[PDB]
Design an enzyme around this catalytic site. Structure first.
Site, PDB file in Angstrom:
ATOM      1  N   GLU A 257      -3.446   8.650  12.639  1.00 57.09           N
ATOM      2  CA  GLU A 257      -2.247   7.959  12.197  1.00 57.09           C
ATOM      3  C   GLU A 257      -1.502   7.378  13.389  1.00 57.09           C
ATOM      4  O   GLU A 257      -1.228   8.083  14.363  1.00 57.09           O
ATOM      5  CB  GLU A 257      -1.341   8.923  11.431  1.00 57.09           C
ATOM      6  CG  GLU A 257      -0.199   8.271  10.665  1.00 57.09           C
ATOM      7  CD  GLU A 257      -0.652   7.552   9.406  1.00 57.09           C
ATOM      8  OE1 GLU A 257      -1.841   7.660   9.044  1.00 57.09           O
ATOM      9  OE2 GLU A 257       0.187   6.890   8.765  1.00 57.09           O
ATOM     10  N   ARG A 258      -1.179   6.089  13.315  1.00 58.09           N
ATOM     11  CA  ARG A 258      -0.270   5.508  14.291  1.00 58.09           C
ATOM     12  C   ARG A 258       1.086   6.183  14.171  1.00 58.09           C
ATOM     13  O   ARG A 258       1.659   6.258  13.081  1.00 58.09           O
ATOM     14  CB  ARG A 258      -0.137   4.004  14.068  1.00 58.09           C
ATOM     15  CG  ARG A 258      -1.445   3.247  14.125  1.00 58.09           C
ATOM     16  CD  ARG A 258      -1.239   1.784  13.782  1.00 58.09           C
ATOM     17  NE  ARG A 258      -2.503   1.070  13.663  1.00 58.09           N
ATOM     18  CZ  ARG A 258      -3.222   1.006  12.549  1.00 58.09           C
ATOM     19  NH1 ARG A 258      -2.803   1.614  11.450  1.00 58.09           N
ATOM     20  NH2 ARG A 258      -4.363   0.335  12.534  1.00 58.09           N
TER      21      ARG A 258
ATOM     22  N   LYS B 123       0.825  -1.204   0.000  1.00 57.56           N
ATOM     23  CA  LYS B 123       0.000   0.000   0.000  1.00 57.56           C
ATOM     24  C   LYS B 123       0.860   1.255   0.000  1.00 57.56           C
ATOM     25  O   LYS B 123       0.567   2.215  -0.722  1.00 57.56           O
ATOM     26  CB  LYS B 123      -0.941  -0.006   1.201  1.00 57.56           C
ATOM     27  CG  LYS B 123      -1.868   1.191   1.262  1.00 57.56           C
ATOM     28  CD  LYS B 123      -3.029   0.947   2.209  1.00 57.56           C
ATOM     29  CE  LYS B 123      -2.618   1.154   3.655  1.00 57.56           C
ATOM     30  NZ  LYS B 123      -2.317   2.580   3.944  1.00 57.56           N
TER      31      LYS B 123
END
Ligand SMILES: Nc1ncnc2c1ncn2[C@@H]1O[C@H](COP(=O)(O)OP(=O)(O)OP(=O)(O)O)[C@@H](O)[C@H]1O
Ligand SMILES: [Mg+2]
Lengths: 469, 47, 517, 122, 50
Positions: free
Chosen positions: A186-187, A160
């Site tokens: 977002e991590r 991805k």
């Protein structure tokens, strides 16, 4: 003399009282101060409601741990503004416009409010247009819409991020455009990872990263998509540039909106989402559009709760998506890059009225052959290829050749192989797959189809393998 | 005949799985909405 | 021997040095009180999350602030709160003592030892809600944190800085997985290398005190209390302690992470922390959402789990590896808190009851269990012997419908079926018996190298054990090469293969026949 | 009240108490019947917000200290046969052995109707 | 409750009574109506706590 003061603090919700003639407008940005030296910071509040008696209810964007009642609150006079311009490329920002890798950068840019209106009905494009990326599988089976929204259904380990860098490269080199990445929820580990990969592939200079992380209150996770969309709107309207906006997990935008709605005391709708779910999704997705020759094309990662496509959040999101790209692991294991599932992916402009008749015919022919091959794959796997018929064996060989020719030498792989990336015109793709379906390459070995460009690359890769015609 | 009948039975079981999954998701959503209705109804009764 | 005159001298020096400067205190008055919540009028300068002290040494946390009162959560001994008492302002947010004196202790969610082994020598204090490392303070997760479990270490690897969710219904082996992960670090501790030592923190939220006692006993019998702290908020504690226990355990283990050390923190049943926070928020009359949760519960868990980071070399290179535990109900991973913590973490280990009953223990569903870090958290040996494992197990799971028609299967299909059965028998493991990485490499080499096709599937386990036993007694040099070089060279592979051949000709199956090809 | 009697027999006399409790759940249910009249917002399935806290305050006194034994045995009603109901789901964490009875085994005539796949012991 | 009282008067005289409550669910619904009209806080399916 004209500033407010904190009255109530209930988690992220802060009520502020102002003088009689200084009530801030809705969605204004307010500033409070936490002076406790351990948690000392400047809280940014966003006016959410006018409660009456000069009280306003605001949602805090930083944690309110350490806030005292009576602290002076300053009204900025405008909504949350983000820095815009060419200088925001190559840097990382948050939902408020603060640079994360270089604190203080961008403070003297032009600043644009993140609450804007979509183009007027007079200015919208009445005719859909296909975005030619140069990828064979996308341009043939899943044609992208220029100024549209493309769903991305790739998990971990299917490339991805590689496809994201590929799209950045293509939008920057084939359209002279820009990319903006909105990481909604977002991590931080994956955010830093994406940052260092974009810096290593030397595509960060063509991207602006806006991170609304997971350890943040729901306000910034709800507004980071609008911040990145405002940067993209400046690149489109003011610079005159095509833009590609990657919204990672739009579902986290929906979920943050639901949390903010719950905090404000609003009664929940069906399932549990906010009563204004479709209005917020529209307020966001209607600014991603083509206007005055320039466009903003968006690729959005979509999460489907409980694999329920009728869930209100994906059902509301899919009302705006023009295409769908599903990255498969069975395709990534075969060594086919990009690992786009040709049967699970789909487009809404794959229509004779848009792509034409030859494009549609070749695409349907390829899809038919691939579906028949996938039907035969179980018999091939359990009982063996030898048991098949001879028409079935012919179809299996032709389908393997097509499925392998769907791969391509991506521009994102150049850093690892040195081979420049390919840009196959859509006409050449149609011709190549027509000739594949006819059978003009039923004798060429399979390894001559992996990661090549158009037809000349195929012929040369074959001749370099002792096979011609 | 057994091959044909078993292919038919597999397709029937797949369509049944699809219908049962649609019904399960429908009633899952209904249960969540009803639970929220009860919770917010009590919370409003107290206010 | 007892130092009684020393006990005289201690309180002697204390009382001879006692002083209490009469400083101006800001006080408020309790107006109402119930169910562990107290509303306090007054205290104009009190801040959010500030600790307050009620009469009788009782503590509270000022959560709700409005123009009328201050809604505070009582942290225990709530039945001693009355209308009219006075509440003093502390001037501090929740802080916890931190230092190396916490290794081997069982403490409150306040840093107070509840084991009885005396006070804890504290280096410094640390606030509970300090910010997580920046996006520019971190570094790619690259070092493996060996759990000692073959299924995890091979299929869903865990790195140093990763957050892996152990999620499963109940009695599926989640506590067992985490305790084995803790016990496996004993050899890392005995090395004395601060780059290899892992300090462990175990947070027990809402657990029966006898369960915490049993966990500590298991950790002691394995010698794992030399480097493990246990932050216990038992089932009888207030909702405040159950809500604060993971933040206390994570405030500790950040003092270590920022000193350049490597920590592993386990949050046993974060679901119970969620229910405690929901109780607190519903008693404070905050607006409820799905399943009556406050609306900032995803924030509650993500703020906690985003502090498990892998710092840069400019910050020391420390790391904090998070193992949260979630109990689903009837395998409903689509519930609210399971959805949240699945969305937050870097990977999930799904433990199942059906697999547990089938004898597959640890009952990890290797089909849906994922690790988004991946082979980046594996040594080269394990990275190459376990790459031939996922596809084999998937092919076995898709062929196991034809388990009774191997006569009608292709030769390759039957070979895949048998190899998959042997591999499923290979990933089983006893409880409280973690394996070092080189023994796991040798076991998976047995599995994927074809050296188990000669052994009856009902003997594989034993065979594996015995072979490792042989290699622990005769050929230690192979394990030493794999341990020091992190890779299995061709020479070591040849040596291992011939050792396997000799052992096979010496091995005795249970069916009577020989296991020689 | 009964737990206080058992605690006296365990702490003062100190000899091998047996404590049986029929449908202890009724404690949870009675706490749930008055939680709205006391002015508390309801929890998920209509239970009190303080469900686990009260169950822990009660269930942690039913225990054997070091050298002083109480062999406890409680019956736990599972509302509508749903083992995912918050009351049994919260009770599950306080027990060393659980004998879980099913209505599917009751309907087959098998007695005691123990579910062998659900029951467990430490 | 009326039927139960009329029956208990006989029960307490050494006589044997049999009382049938046809659709106690209708009583539960009537009690839920009474309790919702007095604005008491509902529970599951809007039934009162008692
Ligand atoms: N690898 C294993 N092999 C054999 N038995 C195991 C294994 N792991 C766990 N068990 C058994 O499972 C039982 C319960 O497991 P455990 O308590 O670890 O599950 P849990 O996730 O803690 O469930 P809960 O938290 O609901 O108690 C233990 O008695 C233990 O003996
Ligand atoms: Mg457990």
């Amino acid at each position: 003399d004209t500033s407010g003061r904190v009255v109530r603090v209930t988690g992220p919700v802060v009520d502020v009282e102002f003088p009689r003639g200084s009530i801030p407008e809705l969605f204004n940005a307010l500033h409070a101060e936490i002076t406790f030296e351990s948690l000392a910071k400047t809280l940014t509040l966003e006016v959410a409601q006018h409660l009456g008696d000069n009280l306003v209810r605001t949602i805090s964007l930083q944690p309110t741990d350490g806030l005292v009642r009576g602290v002076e609150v300053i009204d900025t006079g405008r909504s949350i503004s983000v820095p815009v311009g060419e200088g925001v490329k190559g840097h990382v920002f948050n939902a408020l416009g603060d640079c994360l890798d270089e604190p203080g950068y961008g403070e003297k840019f032009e600043h644009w409010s993140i609450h804007r209106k979509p183009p007027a009905f007079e200015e919208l494009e009445p005719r859909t247009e296909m975005l030619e990326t140069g990828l064979k599988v996308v341009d043939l089976l899943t044609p992208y819409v220029r100024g549209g929204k493309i769903a991305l259904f790739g998990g971990a380990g299917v490339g991805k991020t590689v496809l994201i860098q590929e799209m950045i490269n293509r939008i920057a080199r084939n359209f002279g455009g820009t990319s903006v990445f909105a990481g909604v929820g977002e991590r931080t580990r994956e955010g830093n990872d994406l940052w260092v990969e974009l810096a290593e592939a030397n595509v960060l200079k063509d991207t602006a990263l806006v991170f609304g992380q997971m350890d943040e209150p729901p306000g910034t996770r709800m507004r980071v998509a609008l911040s990145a969309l405002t940067m993209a709107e400046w690149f489109r309207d003011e610079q005159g540039q095509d833009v590609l906006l990657f919204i990672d997990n739009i579902f986290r935008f929906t979920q943050a909106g639901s949390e903010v709605s719950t905090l404000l005391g609003r009664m929940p709708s069906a399932v549990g989402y906010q009563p204004t779910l479709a209005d917020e999704m529209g307020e966001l997705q209607e600014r991603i559009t083509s206007t005055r020759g320039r466009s903003i094309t968006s690729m959005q990662a979509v999460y489907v709760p409980a694999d329920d496509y009728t869930d209100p959040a994906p059902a509301t999101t899919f009302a705006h998506l023009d295409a769908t790209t599903e990255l498969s692991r069975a395709v990534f294991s075969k060594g086919i890059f990009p690992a786009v599932d040709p049967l699970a992916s789909s487009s809404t402009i794959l229509d004779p009225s848009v792509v034409g008749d030859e494009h549609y015919r070749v695409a349907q022919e390829v899809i038919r052959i691939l579906q028949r091959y996938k039907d035969l794959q179980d018999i091939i796997a359990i009982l063996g290829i030898d048991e098949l018929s001879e028409e079935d064996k012919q179809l299996v060989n032709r389908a393997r050749r097509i499925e392998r020719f769907l791969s391509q030498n991506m521009m994102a792989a150049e850093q690892f192989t040195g081979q420049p990336g390919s840009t196959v015109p859509v006409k050449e793709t149609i011709e190549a797959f027509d000739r594949l379906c006819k059978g003009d390459f039923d004798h060429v070995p399979e390894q001559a189809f992996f990661l090549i460009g158009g037809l000349d690359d195929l012929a040369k890769k074959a001749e370099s393998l002792g096979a011609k015609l | 005949s057994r091959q044909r009948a078993m292919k038919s039975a597999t397709d029937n079981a797949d369509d049944l799985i699809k219908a049962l999954t649609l019904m399960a998701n429908r009633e899952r959503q209904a249960q969540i909405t009803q639970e929220i209705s009860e919770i917010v109804g009590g919370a409003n009764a107290l206010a | 021997t007892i130092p009684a005159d020393d006990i005289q001298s201690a309180i002697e020096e204390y009382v001879s040095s006692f002083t209490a400067d009469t400083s101006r205190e800001e006080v408020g008055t309790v107006v109402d009180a119930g169910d562990g919540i107290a509303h306090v009028e007054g205290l104009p300068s009190v801040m959010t999350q500030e600790l307050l002290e009620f009469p009788g040494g009782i503590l509270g946390v000022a959560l709700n602030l409005d123009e009328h009162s201050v809604g505070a959560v009582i942290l225990g001994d709530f039945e001693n709160i009355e209308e009219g008492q006075q509440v003093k302002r502390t001037g501090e947010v929740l802080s916890v003592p931190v230092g190396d004196g916490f290794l081997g202790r069982v403490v409150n969610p306040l840093g107070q030892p509840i084991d009885g082994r005396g006070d804890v020598d504290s280096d410094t204090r640390r606030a509970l809600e300090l910010q997580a490392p920046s996006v520019v303070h971190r570094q790619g997760v690259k070092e493996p944190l060996q759990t000692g479990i073959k299924a995890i270490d091979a299929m869903t690897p865990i790195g140093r800085g990763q957050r892996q969710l152990i999620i499963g219904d109940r009695k599926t082996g989640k506590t067992a997985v985490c305790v084995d992960t803790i016990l496996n670090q004993r050899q890392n501790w005995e090395s004395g290398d601060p780059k290899k030592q892992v300090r462990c923190v175990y947070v027990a939220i809402g657990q029966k005190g006898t369960t915490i006692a049993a966990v500590r006993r298991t950790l002691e019998e394995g010698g794992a209390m030399d480097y493990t702290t246990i932050v216990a908020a038992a089932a009888s504690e207030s909702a405040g302690f159950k809500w604060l226990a993971p933040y206390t355990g994570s405030a500790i283990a950040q003092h270590w992470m920022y000193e350049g050390k490597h920590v592993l923190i386990i949050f046993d049943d974060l679901t119970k922390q969620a229910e405690a926070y929901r109780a607190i928020s519903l008693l404070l009359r905050r607006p409820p959402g799905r399943e009556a949760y406050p609306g900032d519960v995803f924030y509650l868990h993500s703020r906690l789990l985003e502090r498990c980071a892998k710092l840069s070399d400019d910050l020391g290179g420390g790391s904090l590896t998070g193992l949260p535990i979630i109990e689903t109900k009837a395998n409903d991973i689509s519930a609210y808190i399971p959805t949240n913590v699945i969305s937050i973490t870097d990977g999930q280990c799904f433990l199942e009851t059906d697999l547990f009953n089938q004898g597959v223990r640890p009952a990890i569903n290797v089909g849906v269990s994922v690790s988004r870090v991946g082979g980046a958290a594996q040594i080269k040996a394990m990275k190459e012997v376990a790459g031939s494992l996922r596809l084999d197990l998937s092919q076995y799971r898709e062929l196991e419908a034809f388990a009774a028609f191997a006569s009608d299967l292709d030769a390759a299909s039957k070979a895949q079926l048998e190899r998959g059965a042997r591999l499923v028998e290979l990933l089983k493991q006893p409880q409280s018996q973690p394996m070092p990485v080189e023994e796991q490499v040798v076991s998976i080499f047995l599995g994927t190298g074809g050296h188990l096709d000669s052994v009856p599937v009902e003997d594989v386990r034993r065979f594996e054990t015995e072979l490792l036993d042989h290699m622990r007694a005769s050929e230690e040099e192979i394990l030493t090469e794999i341990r020091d070089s992190q890779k299995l060279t061709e020479e070591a592979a040849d040596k291992l293969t011939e050792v396997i051949k000799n052992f096979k000709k010496g091995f005795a199956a249970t069916g009577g026949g020989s296991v020689v090809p």
